[PDB]
Amino acid sequence: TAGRVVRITGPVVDVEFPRGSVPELFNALHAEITFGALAKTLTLEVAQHLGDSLVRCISMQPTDGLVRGVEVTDTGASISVPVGDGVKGHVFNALGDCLDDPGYGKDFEHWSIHRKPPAFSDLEPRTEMLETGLKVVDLLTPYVRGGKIALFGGAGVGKTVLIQEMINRIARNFGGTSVFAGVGERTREGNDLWVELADANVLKDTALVFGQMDEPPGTRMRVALSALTMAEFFRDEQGQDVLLFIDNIFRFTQAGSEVSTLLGRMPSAVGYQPTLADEMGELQERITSTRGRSITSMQAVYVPADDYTDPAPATTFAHLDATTELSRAVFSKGIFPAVDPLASSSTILDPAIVGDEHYRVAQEVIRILQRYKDLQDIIAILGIDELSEEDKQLVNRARRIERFLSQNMMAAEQFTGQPGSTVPLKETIEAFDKLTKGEFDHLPEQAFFLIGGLDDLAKKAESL
Amino acid sequence: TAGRVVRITGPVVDVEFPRGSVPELFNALHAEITFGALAKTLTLEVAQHLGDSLVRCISMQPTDGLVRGVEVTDTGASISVPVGDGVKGHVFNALGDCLDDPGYGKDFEHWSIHRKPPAFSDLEPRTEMLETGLKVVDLLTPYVRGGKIALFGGAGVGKTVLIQEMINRIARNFGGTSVFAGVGERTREGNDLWVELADANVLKDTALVFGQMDEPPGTRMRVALSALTMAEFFRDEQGQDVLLFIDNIFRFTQAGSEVSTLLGRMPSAVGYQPTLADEMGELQERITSTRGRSITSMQAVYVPADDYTDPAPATTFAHLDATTELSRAVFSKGIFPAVDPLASSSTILDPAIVGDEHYRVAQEVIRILQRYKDLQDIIAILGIDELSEEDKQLVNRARRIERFLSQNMMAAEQFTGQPGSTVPLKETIEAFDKLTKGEFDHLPEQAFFLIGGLDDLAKKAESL
Amino acid sequence: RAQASGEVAQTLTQADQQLSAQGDQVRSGLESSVDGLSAKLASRILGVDV
Amino acid sequence: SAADIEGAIEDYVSSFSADTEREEIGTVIDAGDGIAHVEGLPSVMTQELLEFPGGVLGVALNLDEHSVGAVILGEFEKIEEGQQVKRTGEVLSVPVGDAFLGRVVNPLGQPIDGQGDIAAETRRALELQAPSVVQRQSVSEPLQTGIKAIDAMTPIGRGQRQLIIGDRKTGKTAVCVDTILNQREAWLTGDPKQQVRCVYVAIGQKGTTIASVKRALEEGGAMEYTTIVAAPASDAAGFKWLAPYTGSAIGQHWMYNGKHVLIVFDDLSKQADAYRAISLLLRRPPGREAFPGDVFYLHSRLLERCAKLSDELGGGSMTGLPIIETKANDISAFIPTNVISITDGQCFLESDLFNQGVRPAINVGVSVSRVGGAAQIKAMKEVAGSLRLDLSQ
Amino acid sequence: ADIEGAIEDYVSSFEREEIGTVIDAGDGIAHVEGLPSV
Amino acid sequence: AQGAQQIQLMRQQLIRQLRTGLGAEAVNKAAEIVRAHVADPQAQSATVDRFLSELEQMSRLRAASRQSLAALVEKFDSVAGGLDADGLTNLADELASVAKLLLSETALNKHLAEPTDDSAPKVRLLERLLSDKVSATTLDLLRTAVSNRWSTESNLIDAVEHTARLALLKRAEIAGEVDEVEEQLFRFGRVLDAEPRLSALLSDYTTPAEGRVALLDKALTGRPGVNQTAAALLSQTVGLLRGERADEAVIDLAELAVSRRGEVVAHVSAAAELSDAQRTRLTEVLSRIYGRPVSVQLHVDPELLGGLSITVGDEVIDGSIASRLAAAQTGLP
Ligand SMILES: Nc1ncnc2c1ncn2[C@@H]1O[C@H](COP(=O)(O)OP(=O)(O)OP(=O)(O)O)[C@@H](O)[C@H]1O
Ligand SMILES: Nc1ncnc2c1ncn2[C@@H]1O[C@H](COP(=O)(O)OP(=O)(O)OP(=O)(O)O)[C@@H](O)[C@H]1O
Ligand SMILES: [Mg+2]
Ligand SMILES: [Mg+2]
């Protein structure tokens, strides 16, 4: 008993089976493309049952070369990926086939990439800060150990640079296991990450899964799940502290959109699939961390059209503990790494967790920046000289704070030439407290740009 | 044998033929309307093959009165228009039937309105400047002889008046022939142009093809091709230099949109036909001038709702050697020809073509006007008083430059009664060099309205 | 540069004239074979001697 | 001059053959606007080339139970119902080889410059997979554009994908043609490791503009090593959709033989429009802005094939300079942001800066090159390490 | 004539238990043929 | 250097122009030569025999409808195995009548073709409507057809029409006219392929089918030479076209007639009527290539320039001399 390709439309293939052998949903089917230049075994994932023993499947590899009526065999189980300590130090694709060493994981334990999230009874909120060394993140968007973190960004605002920096800061000294999931990102950045991890000897603790944007929608949908399955194995079957980097999670939903109309679904607002929220919720809730079992997840979320009101970013915002929101407006002002200090937020930025000093300093910084943002309209036309003396002082402090939130990051060395720098949390709090009280109003603002710390501030002030 | 009308949907008619007699695309078919005052032989143009031996066709005369099952006879050839020297001095509709003398041209040579564009090997870029006598055109948007010129503008900004001005400045003394193609402008304007050209004795050198607004969409989308076939014959068979005035190529795109809606093709971004770019390319790559034989073309382009981001203006922008974007903002100020100096551009405004001095003066004028545009919000709120002295001087001479770009067009005499001027290119360059150097910044702003020249500028300065 | 362009134009025109004349010459040579070439092609399409 | 005039005909006649074989032929049942539905062809592959009788080619996009929805690649005026459609037996593919240097070709690879046929070395499928993560190496060899702003603030390296994005008449094609022209000094070296070959893909451009670009390249000597894959605006939506892929295939052939290529796509915005037209004519329901859901894929599938191959694969590279036309200076639109996220940098040419006298008109703040210093020589990196951020500030 | 009456009788014919069958299933929705009294 | 390259390009342009002219002249002369050669009858027969020597060395129903139609034809075999000529004629006529009823009463068909599992209500409806009007065998066939589920309502009409055709086909087979019916159906197939206007007139199912069958009788099936079984088949098909074109319907009916006997029709185009020797050679070689007995339908097409071409299903073997001439002409470098 085997199927037969009836209708092919881009990445969506309809397959007819005998009435008694219709495969279940999310099963993996294998067709064959025999044309020499594109010959391959084509993995289809059953996405719908549409009656008369016809199923509709989303192809993982490109369907170019597929012929109507070609036999389609049923695996009887969903797409499965290798799991274990073996997958560490290796690169896989969405399907679980190894890239840097073909035929490597063919005999490891295999888990289906589809599973229900942990029971609500097993969820425990995380309230432990994760010190990054970045001033803006540590002060206004403090990350959570075991929680979920996001880098929201428009197109080309430095999401990949900042997530590579985050790998450099969190994963180097991490005693656990890392999993990086390239979900429709740029392949060049993936290769740079791979070589960087190999050079720093972090590769042996990291398993990479790539579904880069050259791949069709099916892989861009299932690569996130494939990497998350390794993350879940490490969380559950080994109790290891896990890091789970994903870049870019939006490519997941976007991929579903590309096949959304071919699957027969009426499009929702802004052309997205109606199941946007449900699919993203399943994937995101699989990433949570149960009690006594930690997955520190960090997801780069692309914001289409630089519009934070777009359905995908808006739906993703509810799934995150900390959200570093990168904006093109800040990036245009040279303030690398592009963080909007006002839009970004964190659930542990409460006085009961980060402390009274930290909370006061962060919230005064936010107050100053919001007031400066409101004043920008007045200054651009009426001029600063017509502002209040208090408002003028606040504007100077706000410019200095905006420029001090910039940092010379390790991953950005090839953007600035200068080497990276790390600012301890206490030093960040002290420096921004002083800035907010005006203890550095005498220094030129350019002295605060890309320095990373008070010693660097003094050195650059001397240089000016 | 003949066919039968099977469906009628506005100006679109589906006709069923026997198996072996299905007409080719773009063939002309003749149906009959026999009801009283609407009786007529109805010309259909095959637009699609629907299968089952049906062809879906575009009616050139309104279908009102057509009956299902009426016999349709295919002529075996596409719609053909008369061509020859005898075509000049006479008025034609899209179908080639003369209006000045109804029986005229039936014995001439007939050319299909549909033909392949000139081969790529026959094309070469034109770079000779066509001096018109208008200051803004000769300075900031030099027109190209043998090239493609466009005049964009919303409703009531001066497209047709500038078209008449250019007919008066270019076509009046032109050695070769001229073709004016109405493509959906007023019949009143067509009659006005006919009488003006007869009065100016330019009619004998020009052929007029109209197909105006009241015509159905098929006529309004094939009249451009009919006039263009006439111009192509003059270009190729007679070796003449040809002017080709089109008012309005937007109405060709809009007729295409209406037909596409009726043909059942899914709509594009803003309701336009999905084949918008394809249709416009088919039309406008024929207007190009091959190597040894020039066809100057000047087109009015209606931008709907003053929206220059509309798909039709945006599509046509890529096809034009020189653009003159008339703006509502400039028109409301009374600065005729209402050209927006910053949005308008020409391909031959290159120092290697127009010279160092002309290029330098044009770029200085554009710099001044762009800086004036940048200061626009500040000027709106607080006025020139709050500007810096450099910016204050720049704004003064920017206002004077903008008003000096206005000219008393010879076609405007019918409105303001003032006779029209013509400023030679050297005088325009000198005058604008002096303006940008501030040599006239002591004269009142009013001296520069609609004056057209330096001597006239001095005379009006004396008057004030 | 103008002198170089002028001499290039001169040599281009001279070469054009020479090549046109030489092609007019080789036309007779081509016509000398046209018949045998056509016969061979006809035989090839038929699969047997023409 | 030579006996080749008769020798070539003699060789063709002697070697000519039309041995019969089973053709597996279908019949057109519906045609119009560049789309044709073909009944039959049971064994047609997806994206297969179908031969219509007039020598016209189409690509089998849709494969339904009833018919095959193909996009006519060329003149569709000669396609009519009942017409007889042969399958080519080869997935969508184009000829490739060194013979394409100095030639202007259709997206199908057949020439349109009026010169002779192109002696293609072989045929490359347009949809071959891009180099994987383990097949690339970091972008480290600069590609000198000759423009101070780009080579200083937004350096372009070999293997990089730099987006030139901006409104009408902001200097985009000027930047790309200057980049192509600046490679003549490298071409004259005769060293494949230094030579940079170029492929200028013209999409939806009027023929006279492509002729102007070709004349600019000839007057600069760049047509000795530059190919033009021209899909003029007159050509149907199929060619405007296929031209970037044909250019990418021609470039990839050299890329995989250890040679460095530079690909200009002028404009990818006009490819998106053509793909929208094709998808709507095929009656795929559209997404946002009436574009197909696959419009992102369209570009990624293309741009991601520009890569710096590893030494094990020959060390070749392909640099992409996609060009995007923004409407009303809105870099935040759909297709602009898609390409910005697919590429390794931007050169946002603004009309405001262009008028202010800043030529090439790079908005320093928005523009960026994510390769950065790695795509600069050490002298330039030392002299201009912080130049872009300094100018933004 | 009798066509309408027989059709109505058949329609009316459509305490036994009612069990339907899933014919379509995709994206959280399942179409169930049968179950006339649902 | 640019000028040197320009003159080199001019030289190559002249060389290519000379080659193009020479090749065009040579190909035109070769076309004249081959046209002259093909004119000889013996030469044309030689070309055909050479092509045969070259050869010598070489549905629209989804799963539910497919299975249900297979079961219906199986039961039709089981029931009509013991039928008679008059009984088969009555079965065909009543199946055509109920097909007409279902086509005209769209609501009745829609209710009858309900895919639900409970077949008993549908059988009861079929009884109440039609039991007193028809014979037992046709009623049993229709009851089984309605009992099985169909992917679409139209599939029920398709199946009853298919069984109606099979009734007449078995009638012909019992009478021994299996070859005559096939060939003579092909005769009308070709006749309706010509005079295409007529094919449209028959295809009109909006007008009452009585007029269509009357037209067919007046034009085609009223002549004495028409086989009775094939005339009944043509009348039955024209009375149930339902949008299918008459010419296509008749050729498909002939295809069904040959398929019911295991053979597959091959359409062969030649410049002139092929002789018996090459005809039998062609049949044998085509059977060898397709692994199935074949029936060749010849078509006289002098435009082929003396070659031979074959089409079987979706496959075409093009040996026409005109095709080779076109390939040579378009193959010029
Ligand atoms: N140069 C001018 N001098 C004086 N008045 C002018 C001038 N140009 C335009 N106008 C005024 O604007 C009116 C409209 O001009 P015109 O007929 O050229 O409009 P248009 O831009 O072609 O618009 P439409 O879309 O209605 O065709 C003219 O009748 C006159 O009132
Ligand atoms: N760096 C420069 N210095 C001076 N002039 C320039 C420069 N770059 C471009 N230009 C000129 O500015 C205009 C821009 O033309 P260009 O072909 O570069 O624009 P584009 O982005 O391709 O526009 P289009 O949308 O019309 O295709 C032309 O006049 C060009 O000659
Ligand atoms: Mg007007
Ligand atoms: Mg350009």
XYZ file of C-alpha atoms in Angstrom, chain B residues 150-167 246-248 298-303 306 324-340 407-413 415:
53
model
C 6.450 62.457 -19.854
C 4.356 65.042 -18.017
C 2.927 63.636 -14.801
C 0.214 65.436 -12.901
C -2.998 65.073 -10.953
C -6.300 66.440 -12.199
C -6.234 70.052 -13.340
C -2.517 70.811 -12.901
C -1.633 71.612 -16.520
C -0.718 68.417 -18.364
C -2.780 69.223 -21.455
C -1.806 72.899 -21.463
C 1.871 71.948 -21.377
C 1.234 69.378 -24.122
C -0.253 72.155 -26.245
C 2.687 74.387 -25.341
C 5.117 71.728 -26.544
C 3.092 71.199 -29.722
C -0.065 60.940 -26.094
C -2.696 62.388 -23.732
C -3.224 60.275 -21.591
C 5.745 63.271 -25.241
C 3.182 61.689 -22.937
C 0.856 63.081 -20.323
C 0.444 60.697 -17.392
C -2.492 61.121 -15.045
C -1.582 60.290 -11.449
C -2.273 62.994 -6.729
C 8.128 66.524 -15.699
C 6.147 65.895 -12.521
C 3.532 68.622 -12.179
C 2.621 69.128 -8.526
C -0.545 70.383 -6.867
C 1.581 72.324 -4.377
C 3.342 74.311 -7.100
C 0.116 74.768 -9.065
C -1.734 76.228 -6.077
C 0.994 78.885 -5.862
C 0.331 79.901 -9.471
C 3.790 78.834 -10.663
C 2.964 77.607 -14.154
C 3.975 75.206 -15.783
C 3.680 73.891 -12.196
C 6.696 71.598 -12.561
C 7.970 70.104 -9.322
C 6.971 81.090 -17.388
C 4.283 82.705 -19.505
C 3.561 79.787 -21.818
C 2.335 80.595 -25.313
C -0.517 78.134 -24.767
C -1.590 80.068 -21.656
C -2.549 83.153 -23.679
C -6.417 81.991 -20.112
